Amino acid sequence: ADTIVAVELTYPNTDIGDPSYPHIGIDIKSVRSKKTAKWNMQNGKVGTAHIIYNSVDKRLSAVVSYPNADSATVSYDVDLDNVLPEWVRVGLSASTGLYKETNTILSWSFTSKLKETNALHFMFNQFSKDQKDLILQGDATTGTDGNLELTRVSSNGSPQGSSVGRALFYAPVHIWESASFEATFTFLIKSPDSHPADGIAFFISNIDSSIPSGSTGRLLGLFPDAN
Amino acid sequence: ADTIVAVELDTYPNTDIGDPSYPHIGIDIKSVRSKKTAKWNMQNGKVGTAHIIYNSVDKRLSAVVSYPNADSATVSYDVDLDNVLPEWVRVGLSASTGLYKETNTILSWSFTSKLKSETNALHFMFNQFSKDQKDLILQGDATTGTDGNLELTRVSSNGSPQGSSVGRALFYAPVHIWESSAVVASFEATFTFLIKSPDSHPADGIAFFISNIDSSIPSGSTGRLLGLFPDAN
Ligand SMILES: Cn1cc(CO[C@H]2O[C@H](CO)[C@@H](O)[C@H](O)[C@@H]2O)nn1
Ligand SMILES: [Ca+2]
Ligand SMILES: [Ca+2]
Ligand SMILES: [Mn+2]
Ligand SMILES: [Mn+2]
């Protein structure tokens, strides 16, 4: 199977370890986050996510926030060095199940540095209908109002259940030789209920990664099961 | 045929096809016959630096080649990439040898593109090349890793260059160079190179190029063709 490392953001699946509230988390080869923190989600408002990892501290951190609101942050010690392969791909993933929400990405940026220093950086502030430097998987689409819609949305912007989609940057990224990065994304999660599902995530995986069979809902397009 | 826009650093004068009587720098728009050239005082065995810039405002392509202490050689040309190239392209480096040869070693390479349609950007920096550089598409005789360098054309087990060779390296991801409702980018490329020919006669040159995403070495583009063009039209 695939090797995944992710920062996840919406629906509590307590039977699989989640806490009773919306949670922010760090996933290392399992959907059962190694660490989490309370995320006071705001339906229909634009959020920001910041992820950073430095090879010095060997620590992955994430912060999510809304204008004039307190942010949530989670940190976790881990040597990517021993978890992921040398080359990887970076992407955004999201899903819905019985419940849903829009999983709109308004922007996405990324920087990798491997110190003769080698680097990669990309900035997406608008998304085009034919974004060739993105690899869309599943239900993801680009174009609508220049946004990236990870899961299925209707003509009127109404979301749909049982949907899963990812978007991976076309070029592979070198993250280790024996190595820092930063990621940022702006999102819009919106639901007509008051129990959105299932969340969004930034992830790093093997270059050939793809959505696992059946990974909608709680599995967030990332994991084949819940172990 | 592929669509190419390139900046060449030509060590071999091919008089019968427009090369001036000396090593030179040139800008190539869909043909190996440069729209504009400038004399280049190539210094054999010395590390050079090439800088290529393009801005949407001027819509002017420029290039400067240099070495330490010596004076630079520069060339410019006005062109609308929105008119010449497809909207998504791939960027790369290409080189070749023919009856005469030279090493075409790349020590470093970086690229930056900006598209204010506010901006979408792409930047890459290669200060060393690994033996299995997955973010690069190698074509032809091109290899990476040896000395942490990129060798565009074939080099023998003892630091010697082979003739009739050709190779290219392309960045894996496609690059958006024009939107239509946004004439940018807006790009800049830099590479560092080492061309040495144990012969008093080096050939054929190195080039930075932009092409259709599926571009590939045209069969027979050795020598004067620099790995870019299929003929000399
Ligand atoms: C005990 N229990 C069972 C369910 C069924 O939930 C569906 O809807 C959820 C939110 O869409 C998904 O997390 C889940 O994977 C599944 O698809 N909810 N609570
Ligand atoms: Ca959950
Ligand atoms: Ca020539
Ligand atoms: Mn969770
Ligand atoms: Mn020439």
Sorted by where each starts, the structural domains of chain B and their CATH numbers stand as 1-233 (2.60.120.200)
User: CA-to-CA distance for B177 and B59, rounded, in angstroms?
Assistant: 12
Bridge partners, B66 (sequence order): B49
Resolution value, angstrom units = 2.3
Alpha helices by DSSP H, A69-202: none
Single-letter residue type at A81 = D
Q: Which of A14, A96, A98, A100 to mutate to test the pocket of ligand 1 (most atoms within 8 A of CB)?
A: A98
Interface residues of A toward B, Cβ cutoff 8 Å, are: 87, 116-126, 128, 130, 132-133, 169-174, 177, 207
Residues in chain A: 227
Method of determination used here: X-ray
Buried b (16+ CB within 10 A) or exposed e, B86-104: ebbbbbbbbbbbbebbbbb
Q: Report chain B residues whose CB lies below 8 A from the CB of A169.
A: 173
**What radius of gyration, in Å, describes the C-alpha atoms of chain A?**
16
Find, among A215, A226, A206, A219, the residue nearest to A1 by Cα. Answer: A206
User: CA-to-CA distance for A181 and B112, rounded, in angstroms?
Assistant: 18
Task: Kindly state the DSSP code that residue A153 receives in the 8-state scheme.
Answer: B
Ligand 3 mean position, distance from CA B13 (Å) = 4
Structure tokens at A215: 């990974």
Structure tokens at A83: 């978890």
DSSP chain B: ---EEEEEEE-S--GGGT--SS-EEEEEESSSS-SEEEE----TTSEEEEEEEEETTTTEEEEEEE-SSSPPEEEEEE--HHHHS-SEEEEEEEEE-SSS----EEEEEEEEEEE----EEEEEEESS--TT-TTEEEEET-EE-GGG-EE-S-B-TTS-B-SS-EEEEEESS-EE---SS-----EEEEEEEE---SSS----EEEEEEEETT--PPTT--GGGTTT-SS--
Find, among A110, A126, A130, the residue nearest to A202 by Cα. Answer: A110
Bridge partners, A134 (sequence order): A169
Instruction: Tell me: cis bond preceding B204? Omega within 30 of 0 counts.
Output: yes
User: CA-to-CA distance for A184 and A121, rounded, in angstroms?
Assistant: 11
Q: Chain B residue with minimal CA distance to A170?
A: B173
Contact A220, A201 (CB under 8 A): yes
Alpha helices by DSSP H, chain A: none
Ligand 3 mean position, distance from CA B124 (Å) = 29
Supply angle C-alpha A7, A8, A12, rounded to 5: 150
Find, among A86, A35, A87, A92, the residue nearest to A61 by Cα. Answer: A35
